[PDB]
């Protein structure tokens, strides 16, 4: 994959499974144009976002929904998505991962960058 | 302060000093509307970016100039800022420290929400 | 402070309150001796550790305690501590400052080193 | 596996390859018994630590060797290994995945827990 992306449950200790994941390029206009989309499995991962061709150099959001995720915790977080900007493909093409490790109040996040 | 950011370099273990710090509020059109900016004193930290009557409900982002701050370990990172989206108060005020580690590629980052 | 601790809650975005830390260096038969305890403040800081020359050159570890603590959440965590080993002071006095943001099965520490 | 160790650059945006991983399982005297080792491959993995017998119920520490690591940049971190300590598989069996982000002054980790 040109893209994964990879959400993991810190509070539970266990992959984010079938959570939203939205992924913007910045547009001409400066805004965040729709890129590619898709839910996690059962392993926390999102892999067939896009192609090599597709993933051109740009700036992109990953934008991760995180909304109701932790309600059955009963806290709602300080935001309703997770996101992660990265700047890329600004030397060739690379592969990107996008690992989150995700809780309610704090996230860290890191991008793997391969080729 | 109704907001504080502090923002440490997890690479050199250090406050990260002098790094600018733009603070942004969801506008009614989905643009960022420009909110408070600074740059961080010798012990990382942002101080005295708002007032609590300034710091009305709304989506706020807060974006770390991170460009060339690891220039000198010869490393480009993952993006040009580091950014924490988080979503104020409603209800009853609050006060906010957004806390940020800070590698080029890797950040961890906590919403502190108090009162 | 030659030592400061501080712990953040990452679940409930607020500091951990009244949370026990032990610190311990290694001792000449290579176990953990106790060398500093106390409890962290309403702002999640633990001050007042030890002396700048009580605190020589070694490896110590921090020990926060983490086993009751998400009780109220319903989850037991991956340990009954969050613990952090540094290696101190390879010249004379430094300050270290350790920053623990937690959750039941992630955490993120910081070790800011400061002269 | 019973047990993976997945280790992160989080300076260079890559997997940690080639660097070495020490378990240990508490024992009765309070000491730390030597239980598995090995180094991480080109994705940051190390897999076959154990087997799931092998893998008894106790306190577990896993002391990723730091040390050198970051020596290319020109800086000596927090500690020679980072540590990761978590109390291992109540309830019958689960498999762990202990994931540490790296960087010299700090790191992230997470234990993954699930039941197969
Ligand atoms: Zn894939
Ligand atoms: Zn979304
Ligand atoms: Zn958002
Ligand atoms: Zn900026
Ligand atoms: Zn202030
Ligand atoms: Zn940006
Ligand atoms: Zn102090
Ligand atoms: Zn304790
Ligand atoms: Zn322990
Ligand atoms: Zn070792
Ligand atoms: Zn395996
Ligand atoms: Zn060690």
Redesign the interface.
Known sequence: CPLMVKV????????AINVAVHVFRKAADD?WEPFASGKTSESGELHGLTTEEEFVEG?YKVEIDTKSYWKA???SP????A?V???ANDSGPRRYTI?A?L????????????N
């Open positions: 993991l449950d810190a509070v539970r200790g266990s992959p805004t700036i915790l009963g806290i300080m935001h309703e998505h996101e900007v990265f700047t690992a490790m809780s309610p109040y704090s996230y860290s996040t890191t991008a793997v960058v391969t």
